[PDB]
């Protein structure tokens, strides 16, 4: 797409290791075309990463020309031993040597010489009649991996450029899978020297692909795919997008230079975190960048951290997000204070993403074997009464307030277990809708307290007598403390199941049940119509 990619230069510094300096020498023959090149033999020079041929164009001078216009008269160059003026059927005789012979490139249809135009160190290359005295060139053969990578670069560039712009979907899929297999890291069980050799080759190929602008090409392909997908075929499109993210991750994994180059697209990468299908690949690419490139941590802003935290909030509890945040906090033993402060201020105080921990007291419930029911045509009395004396309570025994609640529980669903449960555990009377409890200050039902006024209100302390009254007819539940009535009650609850007195507590309490008769004399007079609970016992029971 660049208009000046067809010009030819003598460049020094880094250009001798790239894939743009690679030319194929192609003799003008089909049989024995892999044989020795002689002095004065015609050939074409093909540029590997573009596919163009060195030529004497009609309008301009020395230039790269398309293959469709590269006739023999335009593209014909020979190596001469000096500027001092057959096709045999075999391997021939070796004449031109790598690294030793000094070759003068001469155009054949014109007789001109490949010279440099007289002026970084970047000389324009022209064709001149006379030339200079240092026009000679030295040939150096490249490795097989470099030339293979350069041809793969040309083919992939052509395919992705026609994809960015019917479209060869299967060719794109096969190319993406082949490229992902091409940048595959060596297995961990490999021998150390072979593993290091394969890592060296992989790093060289990653550098070669980065130097030809393949990362930017993959980014433009991803942008074009997102534009197409925003506006089956959709399954193929999302598969190609997933393979593109895998290719990007494989291209930048383990290479510091590629990640440092890619750190400029941090806003783009963070902004593409909203989508469900693209989230895992973006997260993998981001983690590779944060592990390798150290300046990407400097480039991280507050909005990026909030986007990552919102990804954690909207996608579930994934620990790879936590790994990304950990990588954001430290890089190679250096702590970034801004990232630490932003993570602490935007992740911790909400207390709804991370699992919480605490130390809680264990709570147990104790009941007498007194069960009260309501049924049609039943010989069961409906008004019942009992009392509880608190001999000793030690609040803050275990740095947590001592649980102590007393009341009525229904056998329909009141099944407290020690340990976990609803809320923060420690489930007692009033922590579900089957128990109705009093703690001295509040009324508890459904694990929701309601503060209720009373004469000299306080928590259940020592020498306190709590009287509980249950009227199953209405139904209603009322409490009294030291004879003083508590100004609150429970009503309109389910009368199914059996009702029993219950006390729930943590450690550090001493209480006594009084049910009347020979099972505890009441310290206060029961209300009118309310029977003591000991009358509910069967005659053949204790």
Partner 1 sequence: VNEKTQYDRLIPILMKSPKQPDPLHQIILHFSRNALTERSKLEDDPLYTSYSSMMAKSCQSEKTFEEKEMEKQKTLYQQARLHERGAAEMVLQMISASKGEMSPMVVETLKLGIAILNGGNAGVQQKMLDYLKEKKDAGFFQSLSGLMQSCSVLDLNAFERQNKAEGLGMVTEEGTREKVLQNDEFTRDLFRFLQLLCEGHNSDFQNFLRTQMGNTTTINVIISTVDYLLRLQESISDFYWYYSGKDIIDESGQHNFSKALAVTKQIFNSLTEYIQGPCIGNQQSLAHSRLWDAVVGFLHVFANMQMKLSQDSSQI
Partner 2 sequence: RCVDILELCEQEDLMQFHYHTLRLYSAVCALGNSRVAYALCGHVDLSQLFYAIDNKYLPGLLRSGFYDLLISIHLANAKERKLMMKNEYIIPITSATRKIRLYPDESKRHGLPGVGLRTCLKPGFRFSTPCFVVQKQSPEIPLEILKTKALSMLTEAVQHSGAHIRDPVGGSVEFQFVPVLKLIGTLLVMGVFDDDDIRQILLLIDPSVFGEHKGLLQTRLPESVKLQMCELLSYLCDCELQHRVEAIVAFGDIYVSKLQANQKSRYNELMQALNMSAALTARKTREFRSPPQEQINMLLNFQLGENCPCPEEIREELYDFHEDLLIHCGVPERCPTTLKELISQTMIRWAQEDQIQDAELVRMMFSLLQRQYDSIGELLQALRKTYTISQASVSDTINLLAALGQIRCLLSVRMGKEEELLMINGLGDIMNNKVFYQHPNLMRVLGMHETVMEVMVDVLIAFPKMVASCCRFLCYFCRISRQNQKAMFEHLSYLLENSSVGLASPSMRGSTPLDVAASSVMDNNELALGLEEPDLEKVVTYLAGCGLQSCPMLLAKGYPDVGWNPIEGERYLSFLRFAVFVNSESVEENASVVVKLLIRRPECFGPALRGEGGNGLLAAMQGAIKISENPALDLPSQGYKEEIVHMGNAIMSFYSALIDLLGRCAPEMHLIQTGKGEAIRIRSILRSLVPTEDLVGIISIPLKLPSLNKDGSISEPDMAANFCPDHKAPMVLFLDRVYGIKDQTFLLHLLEVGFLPDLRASASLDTVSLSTTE
Partner 3 sequence: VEIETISPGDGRTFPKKGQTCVVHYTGMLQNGKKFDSSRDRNKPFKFRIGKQEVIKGFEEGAAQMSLGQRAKLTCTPDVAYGATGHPGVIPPNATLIFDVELLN
Residues annotated in the binding site for ATP, as ranges?
Answer: 31, 44
User: Which of these ranges, 40-48, 178-186, 263-271, 423-431, lies near partner 2 under the rule CB under 8 A?
Assistant: 423-431
Stretch that binds partner 3, among 26-34, 165-173, 201-209, 452-460 (CB under 8 A): 452-460
- Residue stretches of the annotated binding site: 31, 44
DSSP SS3 for 156: helix
- Residue 288: cis peptide before it, omega within 30 degrees of 0: no
Query: Cβ(413)–Cβ(422) under 8 Å?
Result: no
Q: 440 near 482, Cβ under 8 Å?
A: no
Among 193, 232, 376, 521, binds partner 1 (CB under 8 A): 193
Question: Which one of Cl ion, partner 2, partner 3, none is in contact with 141 (Cβ closer than 5 to 8 A by kind)?
Answer: none
Based on the shown chain and the rule CB under 8 A, indicate whether residue 358 belongs to the binding site for partner 2. yes
Distance CA 119, CA 125 (A): 11
Residues from 424 through 483 that contact partner 2 (CB under 8 A): 424-425
Rounded to an integer, what is the distance from CA 249 to the centroid of its chain? 13
Q: Contact between 99 and partner 3 (CB under 8 A)? A: no
Q: Which of residues 359-378 bind partner 2 (CB under 8 A)?
A: 359-360
User: How far, in Å, are 82, 322, 325 from residue 319 at the CA level?
Assistant: 69, 5, 10
Query: Segment near partner 3 (CB under 8 A), from 65-73, 127-135, 396-404, 413-421?
Result: 396-404
Task: Give the per-residue contact string, 140-159, with partner 1 (x = CB under 8 A; - = no).
Answer: ---x----------------
CA distances from 82 to 79, 104, 108, 501 (A): 9, 7, 15, 116
CA pair distance 183, 262, nearest whole angstrom = 17
338 counts as binding partner 3 under rule CB under 8 A: no
Site for partner 1 in 298-317 (CB under 8 A): none
Tell which one of 169, 374, 441, 465 touches partner 3 (CB under 8 A): 441
Residue 513's H or E segment, with its range, is strand 509-514
Query: Pick from 140, 166, 378, 456: which binds partner 3 (CB under 8 A)?
Result: 456
The reply on whether position 196 binds partner 1 by CB under 8 A is yes
Binding-residue pattern over the window 331 to 350 for partner 2, x denoting contact by CB under 8 A: x-xxxxxx-xx-xx--xx--
| Per-residue interface string for the shown chain with partner 1, residues 77-116, x marking contact by CB under 8 A | ----------------------x-----------------
Bridge partners (DSSP) listed for residue 105: 79
Q: In three state form, how does the secondary structure of 295-325 look?
A: HHHHHCCHHHHHHHHHHHHHHCCCHHHHHHH
> What DSSP string runs through 196-242?
HHHHHHHHHHHHHHHHTTHHHHHHHHHHHHHHHHH--HHHHHHHHHH
Q: Which residues of this chain interact with partner 1, rule CB under 8 A?
A: 99, 143, 192-193, 196, 199-200, 203
By the criterion CB under 8 A, which residues form the site for partner 3? 341, 344-345, 348-351, 356, 358-359, 396, 399-401, 423-424, 441, 451, 456-459, 461
């Amino acid at each position: 797409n660049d208009a000046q990619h067809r010009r030819i230069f003598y460049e020094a510094g880094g250009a001798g290791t790239r894939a743009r300096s690679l030319w194929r020498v192609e003799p003008l023959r089909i049989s024995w075309s892999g044989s020795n090149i002689r002095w004065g033999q015609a050939f074409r020079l093909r540029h590997i990463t573009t596919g163009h041929y060195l030529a004497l164009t009609e309008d301009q001078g020395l230039l790269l020309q398309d293959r469709a216009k590269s006739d023999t008269k335009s593209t014909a160059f020979s190596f001469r031993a000096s500027k001092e003026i057959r096709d045999i059927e075999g391997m021939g005789v070796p004449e031109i040597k790598y690294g030793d012979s000094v070759c003068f490139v001469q155009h054949i249809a014109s007789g001109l010489w490949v010279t440099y135009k007289a002026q970084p160190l970047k000389r324009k290359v022209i064709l001149h009649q006379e030339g200079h005295m240092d026009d000679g060139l030295t040939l150096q053969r490249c490795q097989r991996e470099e030339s293979q990578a350069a041809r793969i670069i040309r083919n992939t560039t052509a395919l992705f450029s026609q994809f960015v712009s019917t479209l060869p979907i299967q060719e794109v899929l096969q190319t993406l899978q082949d490229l992902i297999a091409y940048f595959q890291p060596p297995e961990e069980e490999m021998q150390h020297e072979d593993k290091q050799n394969k890592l060296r080759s992989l790093k060289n190929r990653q550098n070669l692909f980065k130097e030809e602008g393949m990362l930017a090409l993959v980014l433009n392909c991803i942008d074009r795919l997102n534009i197409y997908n925003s506006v089956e075929s959709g399954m193929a499109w999302k598969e190609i997008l997933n393979l593109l993210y895998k290719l990007l991750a494989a291209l930048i994994r383990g290479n510091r230079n590629n990640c440092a180059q890619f750190s400029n697209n941090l806003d783009w990468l963070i902004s593409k975190l909203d989508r469900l299908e693209s989230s895992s690949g973006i997260l993998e690419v981001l983690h590779c960048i944060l592990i390798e490139s150290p300046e990407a941590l400097n480039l991280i802003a507050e909005g990026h951290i909030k986007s990552i935290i919102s990804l954690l909030d909207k996608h579930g509890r994934n620990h790879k997000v936590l790994d990304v945040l950990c990588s954001l906090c430290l890089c190679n033993g250096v702590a970034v204070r801004a990232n630490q402060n932003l993570i602490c201020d935007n992740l911790l105080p909400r207390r709804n993403l991370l699992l919480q921990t605490r130390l809680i007291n264990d709570v147990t419930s104790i009941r007498p074997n007194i069960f009260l029911g309501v049924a049609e045509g039943s010989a069961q009395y409906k008004k019942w009464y009992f009392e509880l004396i608190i001999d000793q309570v030690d609040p803050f025994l275990t740095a947590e307030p001592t649980h102590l609640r007393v009341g009525w529980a229904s056998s329909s669903g009141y099944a407290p277990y020690p340990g976990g449960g609803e809320g923060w555990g420690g489930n007692g009377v009033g922590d579900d809708l089957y128990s109705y409890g009093f703690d001295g200050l509040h009324l508890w039902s459904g694990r929701i307290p309601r503060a209720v006024a009373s004469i000299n209100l306080h928590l259940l302390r020592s020498d306190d007598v709590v009287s509980c009254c249950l009227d199953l007819g209405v139904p209603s539940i009322s409490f009294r403390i030291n004879g003083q009535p508590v100004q609150g009650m429970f009503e309109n609850f389910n009368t199914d199941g059996l009702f029993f007195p219950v006390v729930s507590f943590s450690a550090g309490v001493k209480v006594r049940f009084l049910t009347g008769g020979r099972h505890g004399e009441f310290k206060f007079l029961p209300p009118s119509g309310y029977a003591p609970c000991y009358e509910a016992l069967l005659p053949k029971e204790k």
